[PDB]
Write a protein that binds this ligand. Structure first.
Ligand SMILES: [Mg+2]
Ligand SMILES: [Mg+2]
Ligand SMILES: [Mg+2]
Ligand SMILES: [Mg+2]
Ligand SMILES: [Mg+2]
Ligand SMILES: [Mg+2]
Ligand SMILES: [Mg+2]
Ligand SMILES: [Mg+2]
Ligand SMILES: [Mg+2]
Ligand SMILES: [Mg+2]
Ligand SMILES: [Mg+2]
Ligand SMILES: [Mg+2]
Ligand SMILES: [Mg+2]
Ligand SMILES: [Mg+2]
Ligand SMILES: [Mg+2]
Ligand SMILES: [Mg+2]
Ligand SMILES: [Mg+2]
Ligand SMILES: [Mg+2]
Ligand SMILES: [Mg+2]
Ligand SMILES: [Mg+2]
Ligand SMILES: [Mg+2]
Ligand SMILES: [Mg+2]
Ligand SMILES: [Mg+2]
Ligand SMILES: [Mg+2]
Ligand SMILES: [Mg+2]
Ligand SMILES: [Mg+2]
Ligand SMILES: [Mg+2]
Ligand SMILES: [Mg+2]
Ligand SMILES: [Mg+2]
Ligand SMILES: [Mg+2]
Ligand SMILES: [Mg+2]
Ligand SMILES: [Mg+2]
Ligand SMILES: [Mg+2]
Ligand SMILES: [Mg+2]
Ligand SMILES: [Mg+2]
Ligand SMILES: [Mg+2]
Lengths: 57, 52
RNA sequence: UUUUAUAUAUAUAUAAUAAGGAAAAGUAUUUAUAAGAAUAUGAUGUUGGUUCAGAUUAAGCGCUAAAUAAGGACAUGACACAUGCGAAUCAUACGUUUAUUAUUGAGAUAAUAAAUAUGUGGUGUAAACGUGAGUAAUUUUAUUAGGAAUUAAUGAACUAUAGAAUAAGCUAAAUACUUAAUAUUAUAUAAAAAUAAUUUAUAUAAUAAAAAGGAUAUAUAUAUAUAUAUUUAUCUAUAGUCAAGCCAAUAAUGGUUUAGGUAGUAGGUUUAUUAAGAGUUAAACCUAGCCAACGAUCCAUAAUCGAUAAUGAAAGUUAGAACGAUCACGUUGACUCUGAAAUAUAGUCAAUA
RNA sequence: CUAGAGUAGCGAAACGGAUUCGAUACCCGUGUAGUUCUAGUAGUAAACUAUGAAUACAAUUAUUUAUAAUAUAUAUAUAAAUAAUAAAUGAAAAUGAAAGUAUUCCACCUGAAGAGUACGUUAGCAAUAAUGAAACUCAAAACAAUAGACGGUUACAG
RNA sequence: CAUAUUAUUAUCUUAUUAUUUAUAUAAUAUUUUUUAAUAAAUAUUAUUAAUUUAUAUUUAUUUAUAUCAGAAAUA
């Protein structure tokens, strides 16, 4: 929206965000990292357990 | 000559007529109501949002 | 079709059966408007360029030319200029100078006439006029029912209202200049909402910033003063009118055989300056940004436009002479005073002649 | 072309022999580079279907080609390739499921010559590759087809 | 190879101007300490002109920054 000159090239200011897609794209990124870490750990534990079972045979 | 077709085929220009009352009067209820009406909220509107 | 029958294991195979027929006489404006020709070819068709038929000019030239009326007239050297004019006006701002009458004795003062604008002053030359050099936009042009910083205790110069117009000094004297007197914003309290601010009212703070008298008459008194009235002036305040300053969006020629450009550069935070925003300028400290093959930066060119002119069926294209609007300039460049507004056709400095 | 190795045949250039008025050519001999392999540079071809890609539709026939069936026979059905066509399109040749009917995107063209030339720039070891004008000259220039002439053009007859 | 004109600058010179420094027995106003010349009255007492003194408004002087225009270099 129109505003007083705030710099040489800046004459507009944000007023509101209809769509927060950019905001969500970072929250989801961090959440994905955190969840992937724990899911990795669980599945790696399962694989190690299966290796132990086949070692016992 | 061509552009005059837009303006009723009148060649030449008069100076723009001045308004006696520069600003709306207080007896124009409709203009005041539109001015006083709640501004449309969001982007199809005209104003800053509550949080921004 | 539909429904049902018999038979067989809710379903399957065979057989029969079908409801859709109603009639009646009379009750224009059409819109805008696009034409080709000659030349290829041994000849034909097609592609393809070239040229021509139309209109026009800021026109020039060759030949010719009667009058009247109207509209234009250095596009080029923003090249250089002899000569004369284009901005003066006020004697009712102050001063001077005479002549007569009167009183006073070479002069003095009045009244009446005049002259005086080579003295001190006021107003006018930011306009108009002419020009198109610069300007491709860093402030330029066009347009928007666009804005704010939410533009000044700005009037420039008229209208409508109220007030005031005081003292000294220096000028030889003043409506010349100085010194002095006096006459919206920031806070605090609340209110509301067009509210995450603005506006409103109040109360303070400072506003606190001025001025000027002339021409006449009369009325007083004692030529001197004074007091009114009429005229023309002066200053302040509110509103209007006319005006200004700043920014936003879109558009504004050619060359990328100009592909990278930009370091105040892009943004942020403060401070100085403005009436006012902003790297506009000046200072400080941070971030690494910003533009660009939908063409940056650089270069060349160019005053821009219209309800203006030409042309076309029209979209458009060309011009920007003439009429009108805007800008810029007044031999060249920078700065300064005044001012509301000037880098003024002013002043200072330099360059050219 | 740059390095290495390889090098039997073929074979630019070169050296000779023939032919010829002349041979600088065709023919013949010896034959260098190259053709080959590895590791690179470069990014040009008549790189052609002289026909960019995608989507919807469009009348037939004949073959194949590939599936799906049904019992060699259904001259079996569904697809794509190929050939000839209808309509349509086109200057025609001709195209024919695209050169048709439509939609979307990209690249390219604006007379011949000068000219893919000059200059500049970019890249490469270089050869070169990309980008790419202008002046001047002219009324030319080209495509398809027609009828001729001509061919050291074919075949058939007399 | 030669001529020309705009543009710039870690260079040189610089009019004028804008700020900014430092200095003035430098001035002018006013405020003091004082000295002369002068005026009324019974030793004066005040007055104007000059002496010293410290606040303003400037002048001369120089410190820095920028700056018309000129060279030098580059394009
Ligand atoms: Mg800012
Ligand atoms: Mg001919
Ligand atoms: Mg003609
Ligand atoms: Mg005339
Ligand atoms: Mg002229
Ligand atoms: Mg002209
Ligand atoms: Mg007089
Ligand atoms: Mg005079
Ligand atoms: Mg003017
Ligand atoms: Mg004019
Ligand atoms: Mg006086
Ligand atoms: Mg005065
Ligand atoms: Mg600022
Ligand atoms: Mg800047
Ligand atoms: Mg700075
Ligand atoms: Mg460009
Ligand atoms: Mg020009
Ligand atoms: Mg111009
Ligand atoms: Mg004109
Ligand atoms: Mg033009
Ligand atoms: Mg003229
Ligand atoms: Mg000027
Ligand atoms: Mg000038
Ligand atoms: Mg002149
Ligand atoms: Mg080799
Ligand atoms: Mg070999
Ligand atoms: Mg051989
Ligand atoms: Mg030969
Ligand atoms: Mg040989
Ligand atoms: Mg090879
Ligand atoms: Mg390669
Ligand atoms: Mg080639
Ligand atoms: Mg090619
Ligand atoms: Mg090709
Ligand atoms: Mg064709
Ligand atoms: Mg080449």
């Amino acid at each position: 929206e129109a505003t007083r000159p705030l710099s040489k090239r800046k004459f507009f200011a944000i007023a509101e965000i209809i769509r927060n897609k950019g905001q969500q794209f970072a929250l989801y990124e961090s959440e994905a990292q955190l969840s992937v870490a724990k899911e990795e750990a669980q599945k790696a534990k399962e694989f190690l357990d299966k290796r132990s079972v086949r070692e016992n045979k | 000559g061509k552009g005059a077709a837009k303006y009723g085929f009148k060649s030449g220009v008069f100076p723009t007529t001045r308004s006696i009352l520069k600003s709306p009067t207080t007896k124009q209820t409709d203009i005041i109501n539109k001015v006083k009406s709640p501004k449309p909220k969001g982007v199809l509107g005209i104003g800053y949002a509550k949080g921004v």
